[PDB]
Amino acid sequence: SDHKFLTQAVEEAYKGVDCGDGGPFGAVIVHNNEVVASCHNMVLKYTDPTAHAEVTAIREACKKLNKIELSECEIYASCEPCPMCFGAIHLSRLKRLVYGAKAEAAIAIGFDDFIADALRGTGVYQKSSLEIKKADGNGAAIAEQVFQNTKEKFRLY
Amino acid sequence: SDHKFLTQAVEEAYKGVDCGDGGPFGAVIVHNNEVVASCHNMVLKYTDPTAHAEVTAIREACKKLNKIELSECEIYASCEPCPMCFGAIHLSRLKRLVYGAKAEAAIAIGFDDFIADALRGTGVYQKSSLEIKKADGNGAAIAEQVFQNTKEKFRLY
Ligand SMILES: O=c1[nH]c(=O)c2ncn([C@@H]3O[C@H](CO)[C@@H](O)[C@H]3O)c2[nH]1
Numbered sequence: 058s059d060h061k062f063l064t065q066a067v068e069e070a071y072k073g074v075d076c077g078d079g080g081p082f083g084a085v086i087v088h089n090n091e092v093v094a095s096c097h098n099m100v101l102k103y104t105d106p107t108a109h110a111e112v113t114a115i116r117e118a119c120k121k122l123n124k125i126e127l128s129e130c131e132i133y134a135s136c137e138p139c140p141m142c143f144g145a146i147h148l149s150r151l152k153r154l155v156y157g158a159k160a161e162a163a164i165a166i167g168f169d170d171f172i173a174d175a176l177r178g179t180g181v182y183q184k185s186s187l188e189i190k191k192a193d194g195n196g197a198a199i200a201e202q203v204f205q206n207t208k209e210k211f212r213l214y
Numbered sequence: 215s216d217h218k219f220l221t222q223a224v225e226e227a228y229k230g231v232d233c234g235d236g237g238p239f240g241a242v243i244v245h246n247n248e249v250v251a252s253c254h255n256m257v258l259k260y261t262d263p264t265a266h267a268e269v270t271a272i273r274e275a276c277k278k279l280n281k282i283e284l285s286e287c288e289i290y291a292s293c294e295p296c297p298m299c300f301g302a303i304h305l306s307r308l309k310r311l312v313y314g315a316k317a318e319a320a321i322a323i324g325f326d327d328f329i330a331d332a333l334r335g336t337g338v339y340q341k342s343s344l345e346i347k348k349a350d351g352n353g354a355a356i357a358e359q360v361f362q363n364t365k366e367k368f369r370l371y
């Protein structure tokens with residue numbers, strides 16, 4: 058289960074940078090092993106700084122399911138979600154988050170040092186009880202390599 | 215002119231509640247005293263839990279200006295932006311936030327305890343640097359009243 062959908066999110070990241078749609082980030086939203094949305098970062102295509110992969114997937118899933126809560130769904134993120142996307146994941150009531158690469162791997166290629174306190178458990182005000190899994194082993198090593206692999210293929214934003 | 219634009223965001227909150235578009239939240243984005251976007255929460259209208267007033271206004275301002283950064287603009291929010299919206303405000307590079315009511319005003323009528331550490335100055339991994347003003351006096355009174363005036367006028371989400 059987790060390897061397959063994490064891998065799908067990684068493939069979306071590569072697809073989006075190759076499309077020119079946005080940065081190397083992918084996200085896949087799954088409903089009891091059925092894929093609901095499979096998206097990548099669309100900031101450049103949409104001229105929308107909120108159109109991260111995770112936000113785009115949530116928007117698409119909710120529209121497809123005619124529901125604003127995704128409480129029976131899980132989300133696979135190629136990279137650790139940022140504070141905005143972690144907030145979106147919270148609001149959408151997704152029940153589980155699996156992510157591949159740590160935020161540091163994106164920051165290593167120039168992305169903003171912009172990390173979600175609530176994901177890392179470092180907040181005073183914002184807490185999370187969302188079930189969160191940081192992948193390890195194979196899928197994770199693949200996910201971490203995305204940023205070195207796509208560095209020269211898109212413009213930072 | 216802070217009071218004028220904060221009042222317009224509170225107006226948007228009431229209009230959206232009256233429309234059935236979403237909850238009692240508005241946001242106005244401004245360039246040197248000219249309105250670039252004026253929006254309210256569209257979560258119900260769009261079946262999109264990311265379509266908070268602030269995210270909606272950022273998307274609309276970025277479309278109107280045809281670019282993904284708003285570093286010359288300021289944003290007026292009728293209520294303290296949540297972690298998702300404050301993350302979007304960070305990513306859009308808005309240079310200043312003026313907000314009307316404290317989050318507790320909205321929590322008091324049914325919304326989640328869901329507060330942005332980085333806005334309140336308790337973030338560790340998320341470090342804001344935009345200028346933030348919490349409205350006082352009449353601005354605060356109008357903004358806090360929204361939640362008493364609109365109680366049980368809309369579907370919670
Ligand atoms: O959650 C995210 N999804 C994206 O699509 C995305 N695109 C760029 N970023 C930035 O990558 C860093 C690591 O999370 C942060 O600077 C994000 O804003 C993203 N973060």
Ligand SMILES: O=c1[nH]c(=O)c2ncn([C@@H]3O[C@H](CO)[C@@H](O)[C@H]3O)c2[nH]1
Nearest residue numbers: 239255266267295296299325326328
């Ligand atoms: O920033 C926000 N914009 C909104 O449109 C909105 N709609 C509802 N809420 C919720 O109000 C509380 C105080 O910020 C949190 O539960 C928000 O999710 C909102 N927060």
Ligand SMILES: [Zn+2]
Nearest residue numbers: 109138139142
């Ligand atoms: Zn994000």
Ligand SMILES: [Zn+2]
Nearest residue numbers: 266296298299
């Ligand atoms: Zn919000």
